[PDB]
Amino acid sequence: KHNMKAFLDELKAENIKKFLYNFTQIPHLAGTEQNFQLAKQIQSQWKEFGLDSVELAHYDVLLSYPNKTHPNYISIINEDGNEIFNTSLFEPPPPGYENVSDIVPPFSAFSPQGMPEGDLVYVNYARTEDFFKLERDMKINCSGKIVIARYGKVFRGNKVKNAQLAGAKGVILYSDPADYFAPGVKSYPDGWNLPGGGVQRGNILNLNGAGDPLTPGYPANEYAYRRGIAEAVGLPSIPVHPIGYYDAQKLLEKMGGSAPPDSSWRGSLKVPYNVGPGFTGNFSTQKVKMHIHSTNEVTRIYNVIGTLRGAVEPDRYVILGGHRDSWVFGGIDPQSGAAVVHEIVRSFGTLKKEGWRPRRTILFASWDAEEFGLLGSTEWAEENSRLLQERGVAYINADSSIEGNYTLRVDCTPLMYSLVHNLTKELKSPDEGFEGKSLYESWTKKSPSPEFSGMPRISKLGSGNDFEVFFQRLGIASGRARYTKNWETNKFSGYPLYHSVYETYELVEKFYDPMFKYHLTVAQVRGGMVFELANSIVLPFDCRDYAVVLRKYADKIYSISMKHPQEMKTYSVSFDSLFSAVKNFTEIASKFSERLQDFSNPIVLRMMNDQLMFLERAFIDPLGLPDRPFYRHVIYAPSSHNKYAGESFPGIYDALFDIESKVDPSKAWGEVKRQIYVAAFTVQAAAETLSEVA
Amino acid sequence: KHNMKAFLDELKAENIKKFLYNFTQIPHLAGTEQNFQLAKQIQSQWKEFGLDSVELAHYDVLLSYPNKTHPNYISIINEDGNEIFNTSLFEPPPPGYENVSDIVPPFSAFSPQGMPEGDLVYVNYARTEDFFKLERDMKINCSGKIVIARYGKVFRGNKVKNAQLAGAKGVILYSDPADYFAPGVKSYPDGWNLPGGGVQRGNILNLNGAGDPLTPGYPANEYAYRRGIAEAVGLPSIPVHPIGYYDAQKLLEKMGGSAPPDSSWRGSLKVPYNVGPGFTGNFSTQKVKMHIHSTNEVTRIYNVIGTLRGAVEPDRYVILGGHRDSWVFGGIDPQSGAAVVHEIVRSFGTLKKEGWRPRRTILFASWDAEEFGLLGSTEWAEENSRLLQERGVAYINADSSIEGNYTLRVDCTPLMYSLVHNLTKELKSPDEGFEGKSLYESWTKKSPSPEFSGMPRISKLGSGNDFEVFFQRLGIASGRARYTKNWETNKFSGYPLYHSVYETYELVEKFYDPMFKYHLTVAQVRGGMVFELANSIVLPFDCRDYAVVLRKYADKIYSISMKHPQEMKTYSVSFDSLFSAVKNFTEIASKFSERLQDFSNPIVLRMMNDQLMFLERAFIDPLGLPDRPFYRHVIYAPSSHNKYAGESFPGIYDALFDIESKVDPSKAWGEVKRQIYVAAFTVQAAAETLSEVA
């Protein structure tokens, strides 16, 4: 038989291990020769594995790199202009590498150049609420200051945007051991913690779903018209640089001005965490000086695109994609995911060589330049948007397969909740103590739904990975799954060695997954999802699950508004239309499900499969959200305060945010009412796509 | 048999005549009770005729009406403030009506209120080139003046926008007998010419495809959020009023200042056609004063939507739509079209009662408020955009069936050229001298293609009727056909009695089509198109015809650019990408046609029907054209100088227009290059939708 069990049984932990080792021996930074060579290797291998076609799709996009002969660093400088302390020029390389070349030193990609010098202000995680605390409550003015902020809690580009709007002239980002050093485990190479010399790389775009900053809307092909840098999309306006906690200690230890407002502002270093501005009495005349000389440069990137043609519905596409570019060795991010994709392709190819084909076409993608802001996936989706929006069934992402070894983590559209529940009930748990139990059982026990007994948590999609263009711009049902830790307050901060030189094969093999059993479980979940999406006669989407969450999201946004009862009275702010639309969606979805259960007629089947496929698409507003033309989904968008998190009813949520501070309450509440009308209309219009067609 | 010949044979001239009489006895102005009563009648009749469902879809949209107790008029006023001449308060009603009530007096819908008084400037047709002639060559400044312009050549809203940008404080529009009085025919009621007291009504929106000015993007339903008037879309900022040629003579006869620059500025009245400003010596102290008191008001409108469910592909929609609202009696516009739609519905219903159903679903629409800027069709398409863009095969418009009795006129997407040619070869010509000949033969003889021997002229779609939202916003293949005159310089001016009280049943029955044979021919063309679109196994679209025109349009836009060879050198302006894309489209379309001719497999059939259906959709850019978010088609848009005309490669055409006058040539040519890249990309992306799908 060629069924799902045959596909899953062909997946082997030992192959994933061999692939991970193969992918992590040298750096594969986007736009470098090494990354192009790996692209060519994967292309050759996917062909050998049995795919019908495997092509490279290249684009010329804005990337950012340090200047090799003019290194970035930060100084404490004295009254005379003597630099009395300098931050490190590189991370101490891990054992046995120390002679690898082309390790990019830590830098914040897309930082502009500059040498600002000023007094420090410490801003905690530099979240919206941290700046509210500083400016509104503590009356500390960040204008003309260099801010220092710890990594964690929110996407670093949000920190940078927040600091810019506060008037900062530069940002220093650092990893505090509170966030990146788990108590009782050793620093790399003797455990999985971050050492004091480790540094987290990463782009600091003000992400708006655009892709390449120079070509919003259109693929960065050979004849593309490019914006000038000043008009580029998403680029920060102040210099930024990341540092490790040994260096941060030296910058923070002299800080004066005000005490931290409370304990949530204190990390684990032996410093006061004073907010500043500037240093205590004796050192009041010293300043901090940044030296940033990175350059933005248009550079060629390469996606590998493999096709396994469908036997029955070749014009329906199920996509499994994940990126290949890494900051350095990519031991977890992304190669633990890419190794899983490679073994999935190998398994589907084995079935194909035996004469099987999936019902629908499967596309496999190895994306480039994800680390520089999702550039490869976004340019390819821009190029192929017409094909994808009329033919795209689903997108399953495959970045890092593991960020811990505790339990499963899943973010997906409500249309895939039932599929995920059903698939995990048929997979074996890899967890100690759950031998012979299902993955659904272990997952549900370890990560309970906050709403439902006996169900697991599944979160909302935002940005931060390559599914963004497919889901938030194009409205293709999307999902992601990986193995994760037990560390809730840290779910957006990254594992300790995230984007550091210490993310190696040895890190994974020694400390995360020596048997590759968690990798294998993740391959079964991602591959099983793709198998079911590509082979089920009726698409495995349950519209009733969307109706359940829409009511949840409507109750939640109403509750936010109801913090302002006098204004809702004054401006006649009613959510009645939105609750009506959700009620109608619930009723229509129930009737559609009955018909779906109740119909030999392939036209009715496909007509109903098209209704299922286009249901996610119906939540797209072609006008986009306010000032966010590429975030078009009306139910979900990346949070405006944290691009990693998804926000529900984002147009209403942003209209309501901090509304009590707006100077023209009439105008502000008018815009809330406008967003309620757009949301109610969109939910009703999506419901109507499930009605009888004529 | 139930085939096309059965459908066509059931159509009867005598029924169209009876329906036209029934629809034109009383005014059916949008938003009035009489128009709602007619909507209910049509709904009842379409049900009786055999449609599966017939519903009213209502919206509350901004309309405009004169004030019944404060009439609009224009005066010549003397030094003292005595109004020594007043224009007419109403058109003399036609014989036998003179006691009809609720005839709306002539007015320009959406004019703001005001009583500006000033000196006149005469601006010919108030086209872009007429204002270029005035300001640039004649050095006449229109600022603070009242302009007087003759109707004709371009949409009146373009005249008004042009006058506003010239600084005019008001506009008077009039019908010159040069344009509205054919030599040798009598004025109504003794012939089809405009009398001196006749006046052309019409909206003066600055049309941008938005629909209701208060709700751009979203349907004007019960909970809709409305823009304030100041932010409304498309509204003119200066008062405007139309008048007949008896009144115009009185305003023009005293005009002084400069002589007309040449004979193309002179109409047929016995006046000098001096351009002004102001009156000759003796009357220099007299002024012109407007009195406009019309009011914009949100008013309910009603579309009738009838459904004939498809037997095989009920989720594919072929739409026949035309409007029902009229300015007064609507003898030609729209009821000559609506009578044709009524008989088409009756004929399809006859087949249905005998057990037949079309392969695909046919939707029939009687739209409201077309005369106020396409409001009913546009709000309904906004409401149902998700259904239409995933299911819409084609839209056939059905406004006025006749504007003359000479030959056929057709505007449609290249995808329907072959269908139109083939259908007209099987229809009988109704023309004297062509008894026993095909309609294709008479049409081709009377209206030859400028490009091809033995082929007829088919023009491009712009705006000005209810197909606009379907084609220019949503990218649904669209067409229109009617009988027309032999009067080429007048093809955008309207027949003489256009939008006047004299457009009656008697006008049509006595002077245009006593036998209703031209109406019957038009019913055969429109109905035959709908029949073939709804019943052909393979959709009757030929992608190769798009490839032919794309090359034509590329040669034409290149030729415009090549008027500026030094700039193309300086700014490296290359059309190479666009010609490459067109060449690729040609090659791919040829290969797709071969496959289409070469495949019992309904999945391949429907897969290929979906490729045909989505090909028009592929020319849509979700970002819209510059500052025109609702004109999304990259190959066609309504001309920015004449909304009635279509423009090809409109983004490049507008970037190039008057470019030699732009102050920053670098920026201007950069935007030309940007538009070439968008067009080349869109053509290539559309071509790729015709490639093998996997």
Ligand SMILES: *[C@@H]1O[C@H](CO)[C@@H](O[C@@H]2O[C@H](CO)[C@@H](O[C@@H]3O[C@H](CO)[C@@H](O)[C@H](O[C@H]4O[C@H](CO)[C@@H](O)[C@H](O)[C@@H]4O)[C@@H]3O)[C@H](O)[C@H]2NC(C)=O)[C@H](O)[C@H]1NC(C)=O
């Ligand atoms: C959820 O689906 C329900 C259908 O089950 C749908 O109900 C619709 O609600 C609208 C708006 O409430 C109804 O609109 C009414 O239509 C009638 C004619 O059918 C009109 O006469 C009404 O207008 C009068 O009353 C208004 C309200 O007081 C006045 O403002 C107005 O000036 C008139 O006096 C009104 O337009 C519509 O009939 C139903 N459709 C049904 C029951 O089939 C509801 O809209 C859906 N929810 C959403 C968010 O779409």
Ligand SMILES: *[C@@H]1O[C@H](CO)[C@@H](O[C@@H]2O[C@H](CO)[C@@H](O[C@@H]3O[C@H](CO)[C@@H](O)[C@H](O[C@H]4O[C@H](CO)[C@@H](O)[C@H](O)[C@@H]4O)[C@@H]3O)[C@H](O)[C@H]2NC(C)=O)[C@H](O)[C@H]1NC(C)=O
């Ligand atoms: C019409 O369809 C044709 C295919 O039949 C398609 O041709 C494609 O053209 C592009 C752009 O001209 C080619 O791009 C090249 O790709 C190779 C690798 O395959 C690259 O090495 C090339 O880059 C080098 O050369 C450039 C030009 O001098 C330099 O700017 C660059 O820095 C490099 O040195 C270049 O990217 C592509 O290979 C073909 N594809 C084929 C032949 O299959 C054409 O693009 C289509 N027209 C449109 C408007 O889409």
Ligand SMILES: *[C@@H]1O[C@H](CO)[C@@H](O[C@@H]2O[C@H](CO)[C@@H](O[C@@H]3O[C@H](CO)[C@@H](O)[C@H](O)[C@@H]3O)[C@H](O)[C@H]2NC(C)=O)[C@H](O)[C@H]1NC(C)=O
């Ligand atoms: C996840 O698994 C559940 C449990 O198997 C699936 O739900 C089950 O789906 C089947 C097939 O539609 C349902 O069977 C139908 O039952 C009705 C009788 O009510 C009958 O008319 C049909 O002929 C058919 O036998 C079954 O009721 C249903 N069970 C439950 C509890 O809902 C679910 O579809 C799977 N989700 C996926 C594939 O996305």
Ligand SMILES: *[C@@H]1O[C@H](CO)[C@@H](O[C@@H]2O[C@H](CO)[C@@H](O[C@@H]3O[C@H](CO)[C@@H](O)[C@H](O)[C@@H]3O)[C@H](O)[C@H]2NC(C)=O)[C@H](O)[C@H]1NC(C)=O
């Ligand atoms: C308009 O009418 C023309 C003339 O009938 C139609 O073109 C004709 O279409 C038929 C059916 O596709 C073609 O027949 C095919 O011929 C090839 C041999 O070359 C064969 O492989 C197929 O089995 C089939 O018989 C025919 O060649 C073609 N004639 C011409 C001159 O093109 C055209 O399709 C009609 N347009 C519509 C319906 O939109």
Ligand SMILES: *[C@@H]1O[C@H](CO[C@@H]2O[C@@H](C)[C@@H](O)[C@@H](O)[C@@H]2O)[C@@H](O[C@@H]2O[C@H](CO)[C@@H](O)[C@H](O)[C@H]2NC(C)=O)[C@H](O)[C@H]1NC(C)=O
């Ligand atoms: C901190 O570094 C500065 C600058 O050093 C230069 O750039 C670094 C990235 C590194 O590559 C060095 O080798 C470079 O010389 C030091 O200040 C410089 O000191 C030298 C020698 O005394 C002097 O000639 C330069 O002008 C100085 N450059 C300045 C002030 O910009 C500084 O000594 C270092 N401080 C410490 C405590 O190590």
Ligand SMILES: *[C@@H]1O[C@H](CO[C@@H]2O[C@@H](C)[C@@H](O)[C@@H](O)[C@@H]2O)[C@@H](O[C@@H]2O[C@H](CO)[C@@H](O)[C@H](O)[C@H]2NC(C)=O)[C@H](O)[C@H]1NC(C)=O
């Ligand atoms: C031109 O008309 C004006 C205004 O007349 C009024 O409004 C018209 C629409 C119409 O409905 C008339 O019946 C209205 O009286 C005339 O000027 C008015 O004349 C009357 C009587 O002499 C005087 O009391 C008003 O104040 C005038 N109103 C003005 C100047 O605004 C004027 O006489 C008419 N001119 C001609 C040549 O007929």
Ligand SMILES: C#CC[C@H](NC(=O)N[C@@H](CCCCNC(=O)c1ccc(I)cc1)C(=O)O)C(=O)O
């Ligand atoms: C944008 C971008 C590029 C680059 N993207 C990432 O590094 N993404 C990483 C971010 C890890 C830290 C935050 N974690 C999450 O956002 C997350 C992780 C897993 C799941 I299932 C759901 C959400 C990832 O998605 O694994 C960056 O953030 O610098």
Ligand SMILES: C#CC[C@H](NC(=O)N[C@@H](CCCCNC(=O)c1ccc(I)cc1)C(=O)O)C(=O)O
């Ligand atoms: C917009 C709007 C409302 C209203 N629309 C119309 O009156 N449309 C009329 C305009 C008749 C005068 C110009 N004629 C054309 O644009 C035309 C007519 C037929 C064909 I086939 C192709 C183009 C119509 O399309 O028949 C108006 O123009 O005032």
Ligand SMILES: *[C@@H]1O[C@H](CO)[C@@H](O[C@@H]2O[C@H](CO)[C@@H](O)[C@H](O)[C@H]2NC(C)=O)[C@H](O)[C@H]1NC(C)=O
């Ligand atoms: C990763 O695995 C690939 C595939 O086996 C290795 O690339 C092959 O190397 C051998 C020996 O040099 C060559 O004969 C083949 O042509 C290569 N095959 C390809 C590129 O498809 C590669 O050497 C391995 N990399 C590491 C670091 O182990």
Ligand SMILES: *[C@@H]1O[C@H](CO)[C@@H](O[C@@H]2O[C@H](CO)[C@@H](O)[C@H](O)[C@H]2NC(C)=O)[C@H](O)[C@H]1NC(C)=O
């Ligand atoms: C237009 O035709 C319609 C349909 O025949 C006429 O409306 C009918 O009028 C009769 C007599 O008053 C009534 O019994 C019916 O109820 C009406 N039917 C409908 C509305 O479906 C209408 O009278 C005609 N109008 C004119 C001006 O002749």
Ligand SMILES: *[C@@H]1O[C@H](CO[C@@H]2O[C@@H](C)[C@@H](O)[C@@H](O)[C@@H]2O)[C@@H](O)[C@H](O)[C@H]1NC(C)=O
């Ligand atoms: C990168 O840096 C190169 C070397 O810069 C020189 O050496 C450093 C240590 C400084 O002293 C600096 O002032 C010197 O100019 C540059 O020559 C080169 O332009 C830069 N590369 C870029 C901008 O891409």
Ligand SMILES: *[C@@H]1O[C@H](CO[C@@H]2O[C@@H](C)[C@@H](O)[C@@H](O)[C@@H]2O)[C@@H](O)[C@H](O)[C@H]1NC(C)=O
């Ligand atoms: C419409 O006009 C009504 C009557 O206006 C009055 O009579 C005319 C002849 C003028 O003399 C005018 O100045 C008078 O006020 C108004 O009462 C009514 O407001 C208007 N209707 C509207 C604006 O919808």
Ligand SMILES: *[C@@H]1O[C@H](CO)[C@@H](O)[C@H](O)[C@H]1NC(C)=O
């Ligand atoms: C903060 O700092 C700068 C001082 O240069 C000033 O321009 C700005 O207005 C200040 N804002 C507040 C709120 O104090």
Ligand SMILES: *[C@@H]1O[C@H](CO)[C@@H](O)[C@H](O)[C@H]1NC(C)=O
């Ligand atoms: C793997 O799981 C064990 C047992 O719970 C834990 O002690 C170990 O640190 C985990 N590894 C990682 C990287 O979390």
Ligand SMILES: *[C@@H]1O[C@H](CO)[C@@H](O)[C@H](O)[C@H]1NC(C)=O
């Ligand atoms: C036209 O007229 C007004 C006079 O009030 C003036 O402001 C405007 O600048 C003039 N423009 C030209 C080009 O003469």
Ligand SMILES: *[C@@H]1O[C@H](CO)[C@@H](O)[C@H](O)[C@H]1NC(C)=O
């Ligand atoms: C109808 O055709 C005849 C003969 O060519 C012509 O004289 C007559 O005026 C036409 N009617 C109209 C309205 O064009």
